[PDB]
């Protein structure tokens, strides 16, 4: 019936005066847009059908055409920013928001999905959806005693669309919108569905990427413990966004960082630091680099969980990007750490692998590493163990590289090297 219509026919039918003829034509448009391969989005837009669809959204007496056009408009909004713009331009936002209160859960869901695609386009549309007052209607849909009574897929759609209202940074979602969503987001962060969980985390990770005031909004809701737990999830789809949230929160104040340590996060790192998925490993080392940039009592917490060996490990063998984060972790550690701690760092075998990394084609890492060595000597002086450290670097051939990095096209490399030799190898 409605399978494989030509756009000329769909146009023909939507232009007829027959509500039914229009419905069948609209369902045909929906199917064109739902075929697994290259949907004629541009031709549909080009035919000028969006205003008609947006218009069918309001036909309360014909729920079917409401659903069909909703789906159709949802898929158009799924494309490029321009295509999504086309839908927004047609007056669809206020209309889709209206459908959230529909008696037909499947039409409400569609409304939720469409608003999801629109806000997902970026800051602007995100904030335009918010100005049309979509948060209230959305949040109302989840106001039930037990989330479990809701349809699995229905609940996932809401969690997803909500995550997009928390997405993007320039600018970040309005403050009071985050405040209005958070209580519901926290509740979803405790649901038993892997998807609701992964998306909830993503949402939380978004709200925690930016100024510390933003992080505080989240941390103050007591979700760190729950994040640390999801951090130990079996499913990569959950662990990835969770590790990210945890990683952002520790880019803030040391008090906020302390929350994750207290939460028990550190215990999950021996795993994360040897994780098969390289990206989890990169994110974990990065997270560690911000923990070693904290207080000494916090650096000790790292030491206590036998994590220094794990860093020595990452520094020794890993994707280069993970090593760069490892180099940072170490250089931050040797930056604010106590002598005794910088001592331990060496007894863990950090020197050799740190040196082999001076053989990298990355000028910034060489600065990070060299900078680290300096911090170690600086602590070796307070002990007078300066020569022992000198020899050590020579044993593994580190001197045979610093002594070469004086003749390096960079300024810091050039100088930091020369100074190192000059001051510790003469």
């Amino acid at each position: 019936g409605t399978v494989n219509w030509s756009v000329e026919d769909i146009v023909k039918g939507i232009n007829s005066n027959n509500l039914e003829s229009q419905l069948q034509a609209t369902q045909a448009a929906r199917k064109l847009l739902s075929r697994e391969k290259q949907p004629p989005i541009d031709n549909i837009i080009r035919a000028g059908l969006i205003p008609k669809f947006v218009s069918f959204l309001g036909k309360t007496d014909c729920s079917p055409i409401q659903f069909e056009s909703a789906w159709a408009l949802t898929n158009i909004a799924s494309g490029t920013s321009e295509q999504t713009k086309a839908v927004v331009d047609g007056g669809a936002i206020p209309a889709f928001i209206s459908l959230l209160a529909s008696p037909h859960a499947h039409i409400s869901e569609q409304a939720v999905w469409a608003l999801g695609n629109i806000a997902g386009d970026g800051s602007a549309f995100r904030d335009l959806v918010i100005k049309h007052g979509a948060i209230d209607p959305l949040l109302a849909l989840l106001a039930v005693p037990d989330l479990s009574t809701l349809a699995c897929g229905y609940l996932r759609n809401l969690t997803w669309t909500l995550s997009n209202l928390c997405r993007n940074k320039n600018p970040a979602p309005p403050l009071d919108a985050v405040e209005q969503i958070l209580p519901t987001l926290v509740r979803l962060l405790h649901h038993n569905d892997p998807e609701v969980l992964a998306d909830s985390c993503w949402a939380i990770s978004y709200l925690t990427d930016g100024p510390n005031e933003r992080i505080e909004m989240v941390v103050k809701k007591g979700v760190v413990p729950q994040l640390v737990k999801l951090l130990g999830a079996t499913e990569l789809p959950i662990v990835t966004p969770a590790l990210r949230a945890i990683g952002n929160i520790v880019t803030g104040t040391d008090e906020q960082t302390q929350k994750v340590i207290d939460a028990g996060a550190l215990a999950v790192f021996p795993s994360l630091l040897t994780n098969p998925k390289t990206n989890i490993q990169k994110e974990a080392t990065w997270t560690m680099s911000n923990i070693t940039a904290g207080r000494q009592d916090q650096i000790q917490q790292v030491v206590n969980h036998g994590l220094v060996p794990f860093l020595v490990g990452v520094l020794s063998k890993a994707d280069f990007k993970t090593q760069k984060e490892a180099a940072w972790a170490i250089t931050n550690y040797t930056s604010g750490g106590t002598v005794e701690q910088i001592v331990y760092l060496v007894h863990c075998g950090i020197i050799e692998p740190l040196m082999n990394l001076l053989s990298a084609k990355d000028t910034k890492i060489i600065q990070v590493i060299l900078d680290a060595i300096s911090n170690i000597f600086q602590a070796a002086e307070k002990l007078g163990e300066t020569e022992k450290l000198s020899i050590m670097i020579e044993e593994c051939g580190g001197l045979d590289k610093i002594e070469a990095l004086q003749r390096h096209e960079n300024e810091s490399v050039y100088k930091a090297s020369l100074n190192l030799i000059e001051k510790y190898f003469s």
Binding site: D209, N248, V250, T251, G252, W286, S289, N290, A293, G294, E325, W328, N332, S335, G336
Partner: peptide, 7 residues
């Protein structure tokens, strides 16, 4: 600020 928000 050593804490690098490598974002």
């Amino acid at each position: 600020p050593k804490k690098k928000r490598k974002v």
